[PDB]
């Protein structure tokens, strides 16, 4: 499982107990688990259980959730995207972020 | 993709163009692709495209399809299972089959 | 396939023939298969078929199932979790 600061879950629209994909930019590993809420404002991203074989402290990851919907909705759907930098500082747009 | 004798698809209830999981008993590889119908009575199992990196002629595989349904139906659902031996000879039950 | 003591399936809400994810704490491997019922009280967890390449006897694993539902219901959904230790002894 992956414990995630509740503020981050809210920004990405991800629910506690929702299925998530984690794609490890650092090492290339890809794995699917579920979300666990960590305390709001903790800025925690914690890989728990077997998932700890797939990421290490300091790894840069992308955490995604997927939903299903009919085609017409899909065609106008806008994902909830949160961008990070630094000490897991959240931003609304990619335009803020260093190299 | 995996091309499969249409008689085998009928027995397992698998549709042309349906998503399938292939679990390689021989080498342990696991992969997801889709079904392609091969000529009825050909007894073909053909791994095509990138899937050819995951299985070789002579490998023993399990090919599964999954469907979704509400819980109450799920609780009484009976899968369509076809058992093989020899020259891809199909049987209805496991009780026929050598070691 | 993975055969699992029916007591354990009952506690986790996992159904015979349901899709399951298996996450191997011992060796890190992750795979998806389906659940088979094993005799009630046996404490069995048996990896069968090609899955025998992904886990060995004595490996510690997490076995999970997933369901879909609309967002409104998902917000309050509560998963069925069973905890184990020792020789597959449930409730701690």
């Amino acid at each position: 499982x992956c414990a995630i600061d509740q503020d981050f879950l809210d920004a990405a629209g991800i629910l506690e107990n929702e299925a998530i994909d984690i794609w490890n930019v650092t090492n290339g590993k890809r794995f699917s688990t579920y979300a666990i809420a960590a305390e709001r404002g903790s800025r925690i991203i914690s890989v728990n259980g077997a998932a700890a074989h797939c990421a290490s402290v300091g790894d840069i990851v992308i955490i995604a959730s997927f939903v299903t919907m009919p085609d017409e909705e899909a065609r106008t759907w806008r994902p909830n995207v949160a961008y990070f930098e630094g000490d897991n500082e959240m931003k609304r747009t990619a335009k803020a972020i260093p190299v | 993709x995996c091309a499969i004798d249409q008689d085998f698809l009928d027995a397992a209830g698998i549709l042309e163009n349906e998503a399938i999981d292939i679990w390689n008993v021989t080498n342990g590889k696991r992969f997801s692709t889709y079904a392609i119908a091969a000529e009825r009575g050909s007894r073909i199992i053909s791994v095509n495209g990138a899937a050819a990196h995951c299985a070789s002629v002579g490998d023993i595989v399990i090919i599964a399809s999954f469907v979704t349904m509400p819980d109450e139906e799920a609780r009484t659902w009976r899968p369509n299972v076809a058992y093989f031996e020899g020259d891809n000879e199909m049987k209805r039950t496991a009780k026929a089959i050598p070691v | 396939x993975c055969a699992i003591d029916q007591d354990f399936l009952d506690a986790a809400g996992i159904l015979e023939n349901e899709a399951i994810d298996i996450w191997n704490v011992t060796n890190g491997k992750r795979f998806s298969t389906y659940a088979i019922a094993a005799e009630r009280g046996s404490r069995i967890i048996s990896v069968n078929g090609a899955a025998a390449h992904c886990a060995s006897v004595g490996d510690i694993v997490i076995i999970a199932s997933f369901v879909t539902m609309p967002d409104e219901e998902a917000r309050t959904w509560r998963p069925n979790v069973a905890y184990f230790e020792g020789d597959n002894e449930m409730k701690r």
Binding site: M69 | - | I45, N48, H53, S56, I62, A64, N80, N88
Partner: peptide, 25 residues
């Protein structure tokens, strides 16, 4: 109309007791 995939349940830290590559069923 937006459908979520949610953890239904889990068996946490069970031990594998048997492995059977040649299983028929």
């Amino acid at each position: 109309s937006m459908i979520r995939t949610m953890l239904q349940g889990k068996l946490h830290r069970v031990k594998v007791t048997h492995a059977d590559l040649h299983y028929e069923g």
